[PDB]
Amino acid sequence: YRTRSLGVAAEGLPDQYADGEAARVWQLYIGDTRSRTAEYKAWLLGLLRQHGCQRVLDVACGTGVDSIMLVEEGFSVTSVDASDKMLKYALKERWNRRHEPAFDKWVIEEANWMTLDKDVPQSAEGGFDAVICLGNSFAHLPDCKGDQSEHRLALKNIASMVRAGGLLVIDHRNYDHILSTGCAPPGKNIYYKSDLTKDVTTSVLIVNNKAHMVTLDYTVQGLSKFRLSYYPHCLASFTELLQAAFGGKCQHSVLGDFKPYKPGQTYIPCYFIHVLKRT
Amino acid sequence: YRTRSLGVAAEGLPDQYADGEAARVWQLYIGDTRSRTAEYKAWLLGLLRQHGCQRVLDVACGTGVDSIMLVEEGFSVTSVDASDKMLKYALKERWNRRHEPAFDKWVIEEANWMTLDKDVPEGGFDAVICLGNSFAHLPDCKGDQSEHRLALKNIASMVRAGGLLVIDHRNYDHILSTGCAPPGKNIYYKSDLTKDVTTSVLIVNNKAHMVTLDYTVGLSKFRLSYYPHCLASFTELLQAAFGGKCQHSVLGDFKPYKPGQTYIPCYFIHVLKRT
Amino acid sequence: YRTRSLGVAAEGLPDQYADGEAARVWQLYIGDTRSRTAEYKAWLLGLLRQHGCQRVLDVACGTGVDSIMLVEEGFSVTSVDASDKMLKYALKERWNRRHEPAFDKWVIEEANWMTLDKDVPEGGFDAVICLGNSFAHLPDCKGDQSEHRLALKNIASMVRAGGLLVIDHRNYDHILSTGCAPPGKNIYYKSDLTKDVTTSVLIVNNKAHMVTLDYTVGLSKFRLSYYPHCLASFTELLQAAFGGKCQHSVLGDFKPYKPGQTYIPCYFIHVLKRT
Amino acid sequence: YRTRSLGVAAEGLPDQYADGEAARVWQLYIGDTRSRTAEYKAWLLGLLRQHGCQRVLDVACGTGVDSIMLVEEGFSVTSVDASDKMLKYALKERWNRRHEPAFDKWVIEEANWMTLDKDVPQSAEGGFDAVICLGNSFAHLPDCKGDQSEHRLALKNIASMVRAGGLLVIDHRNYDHILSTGCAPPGKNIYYKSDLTKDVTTSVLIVNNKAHMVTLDYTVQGLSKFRLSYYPHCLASFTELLQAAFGGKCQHSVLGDFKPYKPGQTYIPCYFIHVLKRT
């Protein structure tokens, strides 16, 4: 006997778990995007301009921080997420600078990976010049069914957002390394340096000999604790998933931490970033 | 072993229960308010202009529908709610008409009853409204009503000297005594959904303590709960909230209410003026 | 991600909730029955011997304390319950006096009301007893009381031609109307624990539907729930269970009950004889 | 709003989860102890008689099947478990043969590992001749705190049940092998052959690079599904845990599937069985 159904709000009532220890401390966590690194800004801006990108779809924009950078650099951006919880900060900022003309034109909407075609809006045009999905968000999507086919669908829908000749930019942490050291240490984000000091417990879940989940239990120092989970995408496999998603008719390369990656290199990157161009 | 903590979102992941069969029927319920009755609009507009109210605080604005009416009628409105999931529709609409000047000036923020002083953004508000039976959403978790006392004190303190509080509650005198909260009885917004409602009364230690409605409305279920505030007792809660320096009257369904009258109202609305 | 399914034990592991602060206070509650009142013993023994009952079925024997009395008094008793956790104490005691011949012959098995025919182990029982307000444990999950109908039919069918059913329920007429189930009022076993009880009444669609007692008794909490059976309605349930071929009378606290009497009883006991 | 507290029964009511899909199918599972293997009976009986054991403590007797064998072979047995759910079948059988004199003397009680000293009863004597904990039950005990110290305590208490000169017989599946193939296949129990046909999903949980849990999700064929978890005890470590438990004053050896085990041997045993004698 719950007093209200799961997932239903009520006027003057916080939504179900808004108020808990874990929530309060996770918000402190997605509120540390106050230092975009210089190397990241110069590489994303450089890639999108080498390719003549003007219209960009930011998938899983979260708080909207990559997107605000884009809007400020003159791109025509539409930014979507499934999480209303995160989208609220994006929408706030647009509203604050609602009065800068670049931000008037900023499009922000709700979308889900699984229905991404129906959810995203597409102008007197059709087809985005580049679609970005960065910060290791794709890995947030679990393989609930078991065979990865939700990953297949999600990547098909993202794929289909990319116009002919356009780019998909999409990253994951280096799960090869993680599975093999058994750790996902903190302080490694190459997009935004934190200055929070954190401990992390790393839990690796292997089902029937295939890694299936990586779960990180954070302690941040005011001592507090939250948990986030990821699907451990191995490099070789993800590349394939992406290839399948454009049906082979594409050009693919791999960066490790913004730089070209050649298998065997001695530098072990924190992140792998895939840039595909639709042919 | 949850895979993520309760209450923590993730890029490209629906928040925890956004997607359930209850949620997706409750957002049809939150969205069936497309017909503010003529009677209500003429009453609220009347009461606010009779008193010279200009700057208004809408507490628990939910989708912002009363507030949109106020913005359109030339009031200076700040509208708050605790629920981000309802506030999202208010924010959306402001954004869409962001281009009308009245809506540029519409202020919308998060606030919670228990910290209302710190949350809301000068020398008071002229009138503060809390209508649609929103106050009744607030449960008495502790047991002694000490959270309604605090909430009311915070709402109270939003009202400047000489200003108004308008605050309503469904007629729980009558519900408790028939054991039923029937649907179709909102005097503010006429639905055209047809619904069945199961009414559950929870009495703790001989005091009514909760009223829980299980709706059926494409057939499917959700549940909402309410604290059954009795008329005599609410009046007292409000009187305590201004410390007795106030004047109070009671409407039943927009009309003056005299105890004993034969017309049994669906809602009681208190209008208080701070002295 | 539970680590083991709900309801599956494991060598050298306490079953799921055996160890909680509620459990370990409820087993103090199940164990405070060390004083069967003189009045009760003289009544039940009297009623069973008046009627010539020899072979008796104790339904919902719990710790087996009424049954132990019967074994000691020379009856041929089979005692069943659904709960393994309460049945464990019955079984223990039989084992300890396994060496007295009366206890060798004591039959103790698991059974559930809903399949009672298949579960209990010839040509009927002489009397079937269901005392201590155990029947009221059975909730009306479906909504229409169709599970009490089935249960009663199964209990009924345990009673041979010319035999008795003795079955009681607390006075829920009176509880519903004061809104309180006070403690200290068991007429079968006097506690000397001191307890506070919060009484919660749940009324669905104007029918009382559940009574939930939150006990406080070294201070700590547990909760038990009950279906509030009203006297007039229970009588009918029982009449339907024998198909009308039966005779029925009502005691209030071991004494004849005439509607209107000034003595308001704690318990109603039905004694029915199959014809 | 639960209607009764977790863990409290009521007359004429099944206990909380007694009735579910999972329960109903797990009972089918511990009801397959109808074929003790010949090799096991001849080895346990032989070991206990080589050492002159007469008084035996069966820890985690579950349904009581090893114990009934012992009572029938003339041992003075006391059999304990924490699970009332399993103990119920042991108690049933004793009651049925209550009238055989060997079974009259059979002692059956509730005990928990963590309080095992206080819980078990000890005759006009003190100290059991041998204490057995077989069938991989010890592995049922989780490391909830994190540092294995519950294992330390539990093994101290079992240890302390063993009289001077007496034996502790205590086994675990071969978790070395399991962790390394990522599988715990079915059909491997060397004590009781099943004739149920089962599929198993094997899930390995590695926390901060130490294996922490092995969770088995069974499907049995009437198609039904239940889950059981285990702590993955590695051979080298368990031996140490046991050594620590007698404080070094003991004699230890290891069997693999009833036979002597020498590290490096080509036969990979399903189970490791430790026989320690207290000095």
Task: Give the whole-angstrom CA distance, residue B150 versus residue B143.
Answer: 14
Q: Which B residues, 80 through 99, put their C-beta within 8 Å of a C-beta on chain A?
A: 81-86, 88, 91, 94-95, 98
Q: Are residues B175 and B160 in the same domain?
A: no
- Helices marked H in D31-173: 38-50, 65-72, 84-96, 101-104, 116-119, 149-160
Same domain, B206 and B100: no
Instruction: Give Cα C139 to chain centroid, integer Å.
Output: 13
Distance, in Å, from the CA atom of A16 to the CA atom of B96, rounded to the nearest integer, reads 28
User: Looking at the structure, do residues B79 and B195 belong to the same domain, yes or no?
Assistant: no
Q: Is residue B121 part of a domain?
A: yes
Resolution of the model in angstroms: 2.5
Residues preceding chain discontinuities in chain A with C to N over 2.5 Å: 221
| 3-state SS class at A183 | coil
B209 labelled binding-site residue = yes
- Nearest of D255, D210, D261, D256 to residue D231 by alpha carbon: D210
Set of chain C residues whose Cβ sits within 8 Å of the Cβ of B140: none
Looking up residue C55, the CATH number of its domain turns out to be: 3.40.50.150
Strand partners, D58: D79, D132
D171 token code pair: 């086994």
* 3-state SS class at C203: strand
CA dihedral C206, C212, C214, C215 (to 10 degrees): 130
Q: How many residues does chain C have?
A: 275
Point out the residue among D1, D205, D212 whose CB comes nearest to the CB of A1: D1
Catalytic (active site) residue C51: no
Alpha-helical (H) ranges within chain C are 23-29, 38-50, 65-72, 84-96, 101-104, 116-119, 146-157, 172-178, 231-241
Q: Residue C31 to residues A147, B253, C58, C89, D276: CA-CA distances in angstroms?
A: 53, 56, 19, 10, 41
Catalytic annotation present for B229:
no
Same domain membership, residue C213 and residue C180: yes
Q: Which helix (H) or strand (E) holds D276?
A: strand D271-278
Q: Smallest Cα–Cα separation from B135: which of A8, A10, A7? A: A10
Q: From which experimental method does this structure derive?
A: X-ray
Q: By C-alpha distance, which of C104, C102, C44 is closest to C74? A: C102
User: Is C98 flagged in the annotation as binding?
Assistant: no
Q: Give the CA distances from residue C161 to residues C48, C51, C246, C269, C274, in Å, rounded to whole numbers and listed in that order.
A: 15, 13, 10, 21, 6
Question: Catalytic annotation on B170?
Answer: yes
A183 shares a domain with A144: no
Choose from B205, B206, B212, B214 for mutation: most chain C CBs within 10 A. Answer: B205
Rounded CA gap, A211 and D203, in Å? 9
Residues of B in contact with A103 (CB under 8 A): none
Handedness of CA C232, C233, C238, C240 (dihedral sign): positive
Instruction: Give a three-class secondary structure readout of D4-67.
Output: CCCCCCCCCCCCCCCCCHHHHHHHHHHCCCCCECHHHHHHHHHHHHHCCCCEEEEECCCCCHHH
- Residue D135 included in any domain: yes
Find the closest chain C residue to B202 by CA distance.
Answer: C202
CB contact under 8 A, B205 and C178: no
Query: At residue A41, what is the residue type?
Result: K
- Give the span between the Cα atoms of A62 and B137, in whole angstroms: 30
Q: What Rg do the C-alpha atoms of chain C give, in angstroms?
A: 19
Q: For C249, how many CA atoms within 13 A lie in the half-sphere containing its CB?
A: 9
Q: How far is CA A50 from the centre of its chain?
A: 22
| Residue C91 known to bind ligand | no
Separation of alpha carbons A70 and D249, rounded Å? 71
Rg over alpha carbons for chain B, rounded to the nearest Å, is: 19
Dmax (CA) for chain C in angstroms is: 59
Q: Are residues C266 and C218 in the same domain?
A: no
Nearest in space to A154 (alpha carbons), one of A165, A172, A139, A167:
A139
Same domain, B164 and B237: yes
In whole angstroms, what is the distance from residue C144 CA to residue C112 CA?
Answer: 20
Closest-CA residue of A relative to D1 is A1
Q: What share of chain B is helix, strand, coil (3-state, %, to 5)?
A: 30, 30, 40
How many Cβ atoms are within 10 Å of D105's Cβ, its own excluded? 12
> Residue B69: which H helix or E strand, with range?
helix B65-72
Q: By the 8 A CB rule, do B209 and B59 touch?
A: no
SS3 at position B7: coil
Nearest C-alpha neighbor of D91 from the set D76, D74, D103, D77 = D103
Distance, CA of A276 to CA of A251 (rounded, Å): 5
Backbone angles phi, psi at D72, to 5 degrees: -70, -30
Here the CATH number for the domain that contains residue A219 is 3.30.46.10
B32 belongs to an annotated ligand binding site: no
Q: Report the alpha-carbon distance of residue D150 to residue D143 in Å, rounded.
A: 6
Q: How far apart are CA C210 and CA C156, in angstroms?
A: 24
Question: Residue A65 and residue A189: Cα distance in Å, rounded?
Answer: 14
Q: Do C79 and C106 form a contact (C-beta atoms < 8 A)? A: yes
Residue A224 lies in a domain: yes
Instruction: Please give the tally of structural domains in chain D.
Output: 2
* Secondary structure class of A102 (helix, strand, coil): helix
Catalytic residue among D51, D140, D163, D177: D140
**Catalytic annotation, pick one of D2, D7, D12, D17:** D17
Q: What domain range is D136 assigned to?
A: 34-173+231-279
* Eight-state DSSP code of residue C10: B
d(CA D170, CA A231): 38
Q: Which is nearest to B133 in space by CA: B178, B107, B172?
A: B172
H helices present in A36-98, as ranges: 38-50, 65-72, 84-96
Helix pair angle (A149-160, A235-246), 10° resolution: 50
Interchain CB distance below 8 Å, C12 and D81: yes
Q: Does B138 touch chain A (CB under 8 A)?
A: yes
Task: Classify residue C95: in a domain, yes or no.
Answer: yes
Residue D17 catalytic?
yes
Same domain, C185 and C85: no
User: Could you tell me which chain D residue has the CA closest to the CA of A215?
Assistant: D207
User: Phi/psi zone of residue D47: left (φ > 0), alpha (ψ -120 to 50 degrees), beta?
Assistant: alpha
Cβ distance D29 to D21 under 8 Å? no
Identify the DSSP state of B91. H
The CA-based angle B17-B22-B25, given to 5 degrees, is 120
Angle at D65 between CA D60 and CA D66, to 5 degrees: 70
Note whether C162 and C219 are same-domain residues: no
Angle at A106 between CA A100 and CA A108, to 5 degrees: 135
- State whether residue D108 is helix, strand or coil: strand
- B272 - beta bridge partners? B165, B248
Residues B14 and B8: their CA atoms lie apart, in Å, by 10
CA distances from A99 to A90, B75, B106, B262 (A): 15, 22, 14, 55
Q: Show residues of chain D in contact with C9, CB under 8 Å.
A: 26, 83-86
A81 annotated binding-site participant? yes
Task: Tell me which residue of A55, A40, A271, A70 sits closest to A174, measured CA to CA.
Answer: A271
Domain assignment present for C147: yes
Q: Token pair 């605090």 is at which residue?
A: B150
In this structure, the strands spanning B196-204 and B207-216 are antiparallel
Nearest CB to D201 within list A3, A204, A207? A207
Q: Confirm whether C226 is a catalytic residue.
A: no
